[PDB]
Amino acid sequence: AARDLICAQKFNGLTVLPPLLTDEMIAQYTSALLAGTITSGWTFGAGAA
Amino acid sequence: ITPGTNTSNQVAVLYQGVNCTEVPVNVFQTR
Numbered sequence: 001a002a003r004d005l006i007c008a009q010k011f012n013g014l015t016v017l018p019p020l021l022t023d024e025m026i027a028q029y030t031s032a033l034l035a036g037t038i039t040s041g042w043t044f045g046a047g048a049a
Numbered sequence: 050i051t052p053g054t055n056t057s058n059q060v061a062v063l064y065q066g067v068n069c070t071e072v073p074v075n076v077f078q079t080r
């Protein structure tokens with residue numbers, strides 16, 4: 001079709017690095033925080049759940 | 050990608066943004 005802006009950005013020496021944590025790992029961290037705060041309350045942040 | 054030179058001198062290189070079917074001028078594909 002037409003040349004994209006991403007190709008013009010990359011082709012002139014400007015790259016974009018990917019983040020270290022993917023969206024699935026952020027979702028797993030959020031799931032762990034929800035499971036802790038539902039099952040245990042505030043006790044999982046002060047030590048053992 | 051190397052560890053410290055006091056430990057070892059083995060080197061692993063990463064070509065960023067391209068697949069390794071065009072890099073020549075243990076192969077692993079990464080995002």
Ligand SMILES: *[C@@H]1O[C@H](CO)[C@@H](O)[C@H](O)[C@H]1NC(C)=O
Nearest residue numbers: 067068069070071077078079
């Ligand atoms: C470039 O790499 C992608 C991801 O591995 C692959 O799907 C694609 O076929 C490669 N292009 C080639 C081999 O021309």
